[PDB]
Design a protein around this ligand. Structure first.
Ligand code: PRM
Ligand SMILES: *[C@@H]1O[C@H](CO[C@@H]2O[C@@H](C)[C@@H](O)[C@@H](O)[C@@H]2O)[C@@H](O)[C@H](O)[C@H]1NC(C)=O
Ligand code: NAG
Ligand code: NAG
Lengths: 534, 536
C-alpha cells in the first residue's frame, strides 16, 4: 500500500495507481464514480450525485465508455479507430479520472478539466490521445477528465417534460465540475484555479458552461478548441429536439410525454443507437441527431443571443482552429470524396457537396456560397474545387463560428487569445489532401510526442512541449505567454480592433490579423441577412 | 481655284471640299474639318432619324471645326482644366451633323487603314472638335486616315417615344451610322481604305461602338473595334422602351407639353436650351453614372437588350480591343456623393460609404446594397477613411465599367471573336484632378491620340515615348486586328484574352506585363451573383 496512491474524497476512500511517464512517475485515479449510474428509470434524466461507498474503491483502471455508436466506415484504420471506444460500452458510465504529479503536489496546483468531443454522439475520457500523464509529469498539472452521456442517452429531449428535459449530458459534465470543487484539494488541486478545455463538441460544451450561470462558479478560465456553443450544429431548438425525439420513438415502436419516454426506457440501448442517425432533417455532414437543446433552462436563450448580450468581464478564454477543419467530414457523405484517393472533384460534384455541407441553405444561399468559394480564374479545376469544398465545411461549422465568438467575447469584456494550428502530425494516417484535420492538434497539446515509442520527430516533441507550456501557462495565469522567457515573440490578446491571433506550428509564433475576415463576414453578416428576408 | 494648295482640294459625293494643311510636330498633315454628312436635323427634324446631306455647289470650305451639338455645359468647377477640357469648344447648335478627316500630307499613295473615333460624354455631351481628339498626330506619325463625327446627344439624340413615328429613339446612333456610310462611300477620295475601317471610342463612345457591333445594319460598315472604358451592356448605356417613354413624357410635362404626335410636336416647338434645362430632372433616383437620354432597346436598332445579344451572338469574324483605366469610378464621386470633393482628400466615414453605395448603385435593393457593402468593406479596418474612400471609387468603377467590360470580353471570346484586353495605369504628369483620383475615366485618351508628342504641352520625355507605343498598338490593331508589332519580337507579346486564361496587359511606362483575370472574384460578384439576387 503506497500512501501517495491513497486518497479520501467525500464519498469515501480511493486507491490510485502509479503510472510511468517519460520523465518520471505520476499518480492516476481512474474510474472514480461521480454520479448514480443513470440506468433503468434514470435513462434521459438529470444525474444524481454518487452515494458514499464503504472500504477502498479501486481507482486503478478506466471505467466503461458511455453507450454510443461505433464507427465502422474504415475497419482497422488508425485514423478512425483512434476515436472508437477503448473500453466496454455501458449506460453505467458516469466516472471521471484524475492525474497528478507523483508525489502529490505540496501546494495547490491549477486544475485543467478536459471535456472530449465526438459530435455529442460519441467519445470517452479513456482514449489514448487524452492521456493526462504527460501534462501531470512535465508541468505538474492536476488534470481531470469525465465521461458524460452522449447520443440519445445524453441529449434526447421532450422539452418541458419531467422525464426527458434535455441537456442531461451537459448536466453530467456540470456534476463532475462540482465534484472537482468539492474534492480536488484532496489530490493537491486548487479548486480556485480551474480551467476547462475541450475540442469540437467538447469545445461547444465548454462554451455552454460559459453561457449557463450555474456552471460559472465552477471554473475560472476556458479553452475552446475547434468548437463553439454558437454555430449551426451545437444546438437545436426545443421544437426540433421534440420532433427528433418523437420520430426516434416512432422508429422503435413507441408508444403524452410520460408514456412515450416510459416506452423509450424499456428499449435496449443498441436499439436507440440503431436509429439515431435516421432522424436528421436533411442529407448532411457535420450535423448530429441529439445535441444540446435551447431549453430556456440550462440555456436561457440561443447561444447566439447569449453571446451578444453577455457580460464576460472576468473571464479569460483561449480559442482556436486547425488548418483544415472540414476535410475529415467530406469522406462521411459527400459524393466524390474518399480517404483512399486524391478526391479531385468536378464542378457538379462541388455544387452537390455544398447542398450537403450547408444543409440548411436555400437555393439562393447555396449559390452565394458557390460563387464565393469558386476560384473564378480556375472555376473547373478539380484540386481547387476539392479544397474549396473542405473550406466551405470548415468555415461554416468551425472557423467562422469561432471568429464570431472571439469577437463578441472580446467586445464584451473577456480577455481572449486565438490561434490557428498548422502542423500536420508526421504519423498521420489520413491522406495528405486532408491537411491538418479536425482533432489532430490534441495529441500535441496532451504531450504524446514525448513518448519515445510513438515515433514522433524530435521537432514534434519540442513543439508539444511548447504547446503544453502555453496551455498550462494559460491555466495558471489566464495568459499563455511564458512569464520567465523575456524574448518570445509575445502572443497578443485577440481584440475586435486588431483581430490578432498566432500560428502554432514548428516555426516560432507568428502574429497574424483577421481570422478569415472577409469570408467570415460573408458567413456571419451576409448569409444570415439573406435567410431572414430571402 | 488656281492659286491654292492643289493638295488640299478634294471631291466627295456631295461636292468639292477645300481642306487645310496643319502642322504636326514631325511634319504637315491634311485636315478636312466640318464636312456636313446630314441635312441639319432642325425644326420638324428634331428627334428624327438623319437624312443624308444634299449635294452642294462650289467648293465647301472644310478648314474649321463646325458647331457642337446642343448640350448641357458643365459649370461645377469654373475655370478648372479638369472639367473645361471636355466642354464645347465651338458654338452650340442643333445644326451640328458634321465630321472631320485627318490624313498624311501629301495624301497616302495606297489605300490606308481608317480609324473612326466616336466620342464619349454619357450620351449627353461631347464633340469631335475637342483638343484631346486631335487626329493630326496619328495621321502624321502613323500615316493613319482618321475620321471623327459629331452625333446628337441628350434629348436631341436620344429622347424617344418608342413605337412613334416622330421620335423613334436612337437617332444619335443613326447619326453615327450615317457617318460610317459616308466613310464607306467617300474615304477612298482621301486615300483611305473603305475595306479596313476600325471604330474606336471611349465611355459612351465605347458603348456606341459596341452597339454598332450588335446592330446588323452597322456590321457591313466596319471591320474591327476598340472599346475604351465602355460597353453596350451594363447598367447605364441603355434603357428599356418603357423607361424611355416614361422619361420623355415626364420631360414633356416639365416643359409644358401635354397621343405621341401632339406631344412630340409640342416638344419640337421648345427652345433647345429649355430641353437641356430639364434634362436631369427625369432620372428615377438620386445617382451618379446615370444619364437621362441614352440608347433605347427599341427592337429595331437594338433587336434585344445588349445582354441578350452578346450572349447569343456569333462574333467569329471580329477582332476587338477592350480595356479600362486604373480608376474608372473616382471622377464620378465628386458629382453627387456627399463627402467627396476634388479640393480635399475626400476621406469618408462608414456612414458616408453606405450612403454613397445607394447613390452609386441606384438600382440596388436594400439586400443588394448590403451585399455590396459587405463585399467592399475591408474587414480588418472597416472604419478606415482612406479605404472607404477608395472602396467607394472601386464600387462605382466596377459596377459601371470594369465588370461590364469583363462580361463583354468573356462573351465575345467564348463566341468566336479575337479579343485583346488592357488596363491603363499611367497618370498623366499634367493631370489637374487630385492624386486620390488616380488615373480617372477618360485620361488614357490624350495618350492614344499622341498629344504628348507636342512639345508645348509639357509632358515628360517618357510620356512621349509611351504615347508613341500606344499609337503603335492602336494602329497595328487597326491594320491587322493584332496590336503586336509583327517585326519587333524583343518586346513582350500581348496575348489574346480568352475565357480559359483571361489574359490582359498593363499599359504604363514599364514594358507590357501580362496579367490574368480582370477583377475575376469581384466581377463574378457583379456579373453572376447580384443578378441572381435580383431574381428573388
Ligand atoms: C434626380 C432629380 N433631381 C432633380 C432631384 C429631385 C436632381 C438633379 C440634379 N442635377 C444633377 C445631379 C446631381 C446629383 C445626383 C444626380 C444628378 C446633375 C449631374 C450632372 N452630372 C450634371 C448636371 C446636373 C444637373 C444640372 C441641372 C439641374 N437642374 C440639375 C442637375
Ligand atoms: C471635403 O469637401 C466636401 C465638400 O465641401 C466642399 O469642399 C470643401 C473643401 C469646402 O470648400 C466646402 O466649403 C465645400 O462645400 C465636404 O463635404 C467634406 O467634409 C470635406 N472633407 C473633409 C472632412 O475635409
Ligand atoms: C475516389 O473513390 C471514391 C470511392 O471509391 C469514388 O467515388 C471517387 O470517384 C474516387 N475519386 C477518384 C480520384 O477517382
Ligand atoms: C508649359 O511650360 C511652360 C514653361 O514652364 C509654361 O509657361 C506653360 O504655361 C506650360 N503650358 C502648359 C501646357 O501647361
Amino acid at each position: 500500500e503506497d500512501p501517495q496512491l491513497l486518497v479520501r474524497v467525500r464519498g469515501g476512500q480511493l486507491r490510485g495507481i502509479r503510472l510511468k511517464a517519460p520523465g518520471g512517475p505520476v499518480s492516476a485515479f481512474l474510474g472514480i464514480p461521480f454520479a448514480e449510474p443513470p440506468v433503468g428509470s434514470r435513462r434521459f434524466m438529470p444525474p444524481e450525485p454518487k452515494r458514499p461507498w464503504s472500504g477502498v474503491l479501486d481507482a486503478t483502471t478506466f471505467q466503461n465508455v458511455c453507450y454510443q455508436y461505433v464507427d465502422t466506415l474504415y475497419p482497422g484504420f488508425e485514423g478512425t479507430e483512434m476515436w472508437n471506444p477503448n473500453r466496454e460500452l455501458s449506460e453505467d458510465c458516469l466516472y471521471l479520472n484524475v492525474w497528478t504529479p507523483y508525489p502529490r503536489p505540496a501546494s495547490p496546483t491549477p486544475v485543467l478539466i478536459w471535456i472530449y468531443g465526438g459530435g455529442f454522439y460519441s467519445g470517452a475520457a479513456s482514449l489514448d490521445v487524452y492521456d493526462g500523464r504527460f501534462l501531470a509529469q512535465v508541468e505538474g498539472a492536476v488534470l481531470v477528465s469525465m465521461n458524460y452521456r452522449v447520443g440519445t442517452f445524453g441529449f434526447l429531449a421532450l422539452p418541458g417534460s419531467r422525464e426527458a428535459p434535455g441537456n442531461v449530458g451537459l448536466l453530467d459534465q456540470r456534476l463532475a465540475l462540482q465534484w472537482v470543487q468539492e474534492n480536488i484539494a484532496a489530490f493537491g488541486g486548487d479548486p480556485m484555479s480551474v480551467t476547462l478545455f475541450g475540442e469540437s463538441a467538447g469545445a461547444a460544451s465548454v462554451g455552454m458552461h460559459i453561457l449557463s450561470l450555474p456552471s460559472r462558479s465552477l471554473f475560472h478560465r476556458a479553452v475552446l478548441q475547434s468548437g463553439t456553443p454558437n454555430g449551426p450544429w451545437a444546438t437545436v431548438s426545443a421544437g426540433e429536439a421534440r420532433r427528433r425525439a418523437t420520430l426516434l420513438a416512432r422508429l422503435v415502436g413507441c408508444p403524452n410525454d410520460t408514456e412515450l419516454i416510459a416506452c423509450l426506457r424499456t428499449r435496449p440501448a443498441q436499439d436507440l443507437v440503431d436509429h439515431e442517425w435516421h432522424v436528421l432533417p436533411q442529407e448532411s455532414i457535420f450535423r448530429f441527431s441529439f445535441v444540446p437543446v435551447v431549453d430556456g433552462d440550462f440555456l436561457s436563450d440561443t447561444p447566439e443571443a447569449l453571446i451578444n448580450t453577455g457580460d464576460f468581464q472576468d473571464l479569460q478564454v483561449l480559442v482556436g482552429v486547425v488548418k483544415d477543419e472540414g476535410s475529415y467530414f467530406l469522406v462521411y457523405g459527400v459524393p466524390g470524396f474518399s480517404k483512399d484517393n486524391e478526391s479531385l472533384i468536378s464542378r457538379a460534384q462541388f455544387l452537390a457537396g455544398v447542398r450537403i455541407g450547408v444543409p440548411q441553405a436555400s437555393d439562393l444561399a447555396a449559390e452565394a456560397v458557390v460563387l464565393h468559394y469558386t476560384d473564378w480564374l480556375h472555376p473547373e479545376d478539380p484540386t481547387h474545387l476539392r479544397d474549396a469544398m473542405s473550406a466551405v465545411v470548415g468555415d461554416h461549422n468551425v472557423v467562422c463560428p469561432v471568429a464570431q465568438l472571439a469577437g463578441r467575447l472580446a467586445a464584451q469584456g473577456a480577455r481572449v487569445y486565438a490561434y490557428i494550428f498548422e502542423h500536420r502530425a508526421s504519423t498521420l494516417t489520413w491522406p495528405l489532401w486532408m491537411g491538418v484535420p479536425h482533432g489532430y492538434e490534441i495529441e500535441f497539446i496532451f504531450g504524446l510526442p514525448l513518448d519515445p515509442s510513438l515515433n514522433y520527430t524530435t521537432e514534434e516533441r519540442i513543439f508539444a512541449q511548447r504547446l503544453m507550456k502555453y496551455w498550462t501557462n494559460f491555466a495558471r495565469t489566464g495568459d499563455p505567454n511564458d512569464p520567465r522567457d523575456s524574448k518570445s515573440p509575445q502572443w497578443p490578446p485577440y481584440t475586435t480592433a486588431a483581430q490578432q491571433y498566432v500560428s502554432l506550428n514548428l516555426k516560432p509564433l507568428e502574429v497574424r490579423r483577421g481570422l478569415r475576415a472577409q469570408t467570415c463576414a460573408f458567413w456571419n453578416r451576409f448569409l444570415p441577412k439573406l435567410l431572414s428576408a430571402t
